[PDB]
Ligand binder design. Structure first.
Ligand SMILES: *Cc1c(COP(=O)(O)O)cnc(C)c1O
Ligand SMILES: *Cc1c(COP(=O)(O)O)cnc(C)c1O
Lengths: 269, 277
């Protein structure tokens, strides 16, 4: 059964409630993380919690708990689930923005759900992305604002002025002439899956260019994939009307996915 | 009474008691639209236009309305009757717990906040306010969504602007909660609603300008045009017309609220009953 830790207690997820005075509800003031488990251990726990604090600070939210307290809650919750878990800690604005231009009455809660990996067919066939001419403002912040992600495709792709940055919940990688191309962290969220893939490429002597791949480059691309802690590496075979390479998951993508899964122990906490 | 209220789950609650499930995608993913409705003489201003805009925002966001507009109107009127004072009414439509395989939010929730109105301080109308320009735009600009994060983090840097101003590539569109008007040579300039939210205060001001034979240009005023401007103001149902005397480091005219701004504000308040429901 899904859980939510809020106000010092593990509740059944469906019973957990937040006051409508919270500025996460009224004004979208909130940041969060997605943490997933392998062998019931949290992957990149410390990197995720550091990113949460970074998101809060960038958003003028004063952390309502220490990272040590959040880590303790997360571990106890995963133990309570007794299955592979997706953990979603949320930091809210709370009820007011002070004259100091900070949110000082922040609330927090942590959702625990049974993990939902994409269907194995999506790894076999790969997925389609829908490009939009828009960017994430405050792109280093993992904020709760996903409206543009909803309003064919597995996921939207932020392509401001035809420069591919990233998906709504995913890092984007292009494969062109055996090179990895991915947006630099001046433009894209500092993905934990992204970090691991860059480390694996360095180990594989695979050249990485940290630049925004262009929509105009997609016809000369052999492969593409998106990354995130739940989806791992998910092949991308179509972006808008453009097929990627010959429309099936590519050799370098499947190799990096295999290496990812074989190596992931090193980053489990 | 005068205590703040929230209508949720068929009941008027004290505002402090109202809670929403954390499963709601308004909390998890920012999936929410809302309106700000205010009263004059305890009557809702532009109620029908606001409720039509709410349904427009919901529909544009793939949210299935969880109540009819007739039912939202009933709730809003009953709540204003309970406050028995000048009220700010905030109806919220939430995404609810799931985004279906039909790419709709079909289990939307709703609630309506009723608060004693808080008009800007009379000094802000006397002195006017400053705005902070950013090189960013509202996507889905016809939708009144709950996403205001940029409005707050954009006071992290900024020394004391009342509001951010979306000026993508130097083209002024609007504020985070306000329509923006420039006055140049006795004529009104304001972004077209292809780019800016269709403000209800904006609509009334254009109606007043049409009555006053005041020329309106529906184009984005440019940051580069501000040195040749006489006046500026921002509009919103609570703030009415609020003079703008500074945008970033640029003073507007001689830094005091202008003649045409005060005249339109006066005509607005003299005429307001026409738009009450
Ligand atoms: C969450 C997120 C990702 C993925 O980050 P991981 O740490 O790999 O799970 C990528 N991009 C965006 C915009 C995100 O919000
Ligand atoms: C709500 C809002 C306004 C003001 O609308 P009114 O109907 O005049 O109250 C203006 N611009 C934006 C972006 C808004 O969200």
């Amino acid at each position: 059964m899904n859980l939510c830790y809020i106000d010092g207690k593990f509740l059944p997820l469906e019973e957990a409630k937040l006051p409508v005075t919270d500025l996460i509800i009224q004004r979208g003031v909130g940041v969060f993380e997605t943490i997933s488990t392998h062998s019931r251990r949290p992957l990149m726990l410390t990197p995720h919690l550091k990113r949460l604090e970074g998101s809060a600070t960038a958003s003028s939210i004063v952390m309502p708990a220490t990272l040590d307290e959040m880590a303790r809650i997360i571990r106890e919750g995963i133990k309570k689930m007794g299955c592979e878990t997706m953990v979603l800690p949320y930091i809210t604005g709370g009820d007011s923005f002070g004259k100091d231009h900070l949110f000082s009455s922040s609330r927090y809660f942590v959702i625990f759900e049974e993990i939902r990996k994409p269907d194995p067919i999506l790894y076999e066939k790969g997925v389609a992305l829908h490009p939009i001419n828009a960017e994430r403002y405050l792109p280093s912040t993992k904020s709760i604002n996903y409206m543009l992600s909803f309003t064919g495709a597995y996921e939207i792709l932020y392509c401001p002025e035809g420069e591919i940055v990233e998906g709504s919940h995913s890092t984007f990688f292009l494969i062109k002439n055996g090179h990895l191309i991915t947006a630099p962290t001046s433009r894209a969220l500092s993905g934990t899956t992204r970090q691991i893939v860059l480390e694996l490429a360095r180990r594989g002597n695979i050249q990485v260019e940290e630049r925004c791949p262009l929509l105009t480059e997609l016809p000369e691309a052999e492969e593409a994939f998106i990354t995130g802690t739940v989806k791992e590496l998910l092949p991308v075979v179509r972006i808008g009307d453009q097929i990627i390479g010959n429309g099936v998951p590519g050799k370098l993508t499947k190799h990096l996915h295999q290496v990812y899964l074989s190596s992931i122990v090193e980053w489990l906490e």
